A paper describes a structure:
Haloarchaeal pleomorphic viruses (HRPVs) infect archaeal hosts living in hypersaline environments. The virions contain two major protein species, a spike protein (VP4 and VP4-like proteins) protruding from the membrane surface and a smaller membrane associated protein (VP3 and VP3-like proteins) residing mostly inside the virion. Here we describe crystallographic structures of VP4-like spike proteins from two pleolipoviruses, HRPV-2 and HRPV-6, showing that these proteins have a unique fold, different from class I–III fusion proteins. VP5 is thus a bona fide fusion protein.
To determine the low-resolution structure and oligomeric state of VP5 on the HRPV-6 surface, we used cryo-electron tomography and sub-tomogram averaging. This was facilitated by Volta phase plate technology, which provided sufficient contrast in the tomographic reconstructions for identification and alignment of the relatively small VP5 (~57 kDa) spikes. Sub-tomogram averaging of 8953 manually picked spikes resolved the VP5 structure in situ at 16-Å resolution, as estimated by Fourier shell correlation (0.143 threshold). Each virion (N = 247) had 35 ± 7 VP5 spikes on the surface and each spike is a monomer with the characteristic triangular shape reminiscent of that seen in the high-resolution X-ray structures. Although the fitting is generally robust (cross-correlation coefficient 0.84), there is additional density in the groove between the N- and C-terminal domains, which slightly protrudes from the EM density, suggesting that VP5 attached to the viral membrane may adopt a more compact conformation than in the crystal. The C-terminus is proximal to the viral membrane, consistent with the predicted C-terminal transmembrane region anchoring VP5 to the membrane. In this model, rigid body fitting placed Val461 close to the membrane but this assertion remains to be validated experimentally. The variable, putative receptor binding N2 subdomain is located at the top of the spike.
Numbering used by the authors: 9 to 498
Amino acid sequence: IGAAAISAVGGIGVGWTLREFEVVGSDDPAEGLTPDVLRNQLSDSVVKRKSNNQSTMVDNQNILDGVEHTAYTEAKIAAIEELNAGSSESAVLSAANSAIDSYETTVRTNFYKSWNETVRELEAMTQTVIAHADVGLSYITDFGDPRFGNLASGTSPNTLKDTTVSMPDGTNFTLLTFRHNTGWDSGNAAYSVVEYNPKEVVTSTNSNTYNTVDGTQYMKFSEWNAVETEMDTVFQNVRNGISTWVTNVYGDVQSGAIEISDLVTPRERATMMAQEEGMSQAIADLIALNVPVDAEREATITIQDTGATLPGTFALTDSSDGPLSAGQTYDPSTFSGDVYFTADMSLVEGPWDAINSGVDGGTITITSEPYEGTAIEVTTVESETVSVPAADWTDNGDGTWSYDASGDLETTITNVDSARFVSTATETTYDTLQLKGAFTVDKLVNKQSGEEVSSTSFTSSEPQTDSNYITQDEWDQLEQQNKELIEKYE
């Protein structure tokens, strides 16, 4: 339940399941700061971190079956090479599991790296509050009972404990276990201590396994552990599945029957699209994870509550979420899987009806919060227009925002005729959103004929199982179906 400010979770965020992913760093506030400003900057950092974690690790749960697909592709190729060489069953499984080892290490390391950064940032934010001393710890570290009365001066209530994780490739990774203690002795009614990480909750006494900063709940164990337990399931299924696969394939599949030595895997295809521009990375990644996508059509969508309209291509994690027909309204909260929408964000536009009629001494007033990355284009009754980007709207704290257009308008005492919001993007900027709120499909444009079609048709390659990809045709179709999907977005 994110914002763009379209009901959807924006800036996805899925390459961490296919490549080494670099974490987003912390923002350090200035020494000479006001408590009101420090509190706003800390709240903004928490919102940004939560939004980043949602769009990457936390909210892409239904694409983890694609990780299983990627892991099967990679392990089976490694096994086929060994089978063709007339190797022992142990050597065949060794090559397949070494492929899973390296793939799991990358996915797990990326996931734990982003937790470590979240948890390191909180400690950096805590240290700032301790140093500024005009802001209380209860503002930045609230885990249920934020009473820091018995905590020593210059001491953090947090402890980042080093926890060794045994990576499948034989290496060790340092996962940071977050411990928080308000400072009271065991025996006091106020005693509050929490200790957890994405893997487990060590202790929770008069505590929440999530932090609350300016009404925002983040570092949720339930959210982080959900991805952790799903990751465990996926790599257990691949290893058990590849064992069953090799046991049933060893000896009967002739050495030389399948030749995949020069195969370009959907994973390899998407990683080459990262170093060479040509399409947005997330839809290339969603294709590599074998998520059903609609490449042939172009949907003009309109968000019910917002009023924003957008042209773009769909993606469903579950194709059984039925066809998305034009003229119909859909609520993604009812759906079995997730809806992804890839659109050119420079084309975001909609009507802004939450505006006061009067333009008094050049001042324009709006009755709703302006959306980030958009400008409200206000047209007066004298047929003059002023473009006001969200950052220029001054908050009155009355539930109203105002802007002084005395320097922009010729007639400063007038009335608003109409107002609309449009994107502030200078160029075509592609983005992949996970639609969370109700949307209506206005029209479906079939490329490159421009025809108006009634419904959508999603496509994906054959899902990998513990018994398939035995024939060369299954493998030939995998490379062919994938390379023509990438071509359709180029």
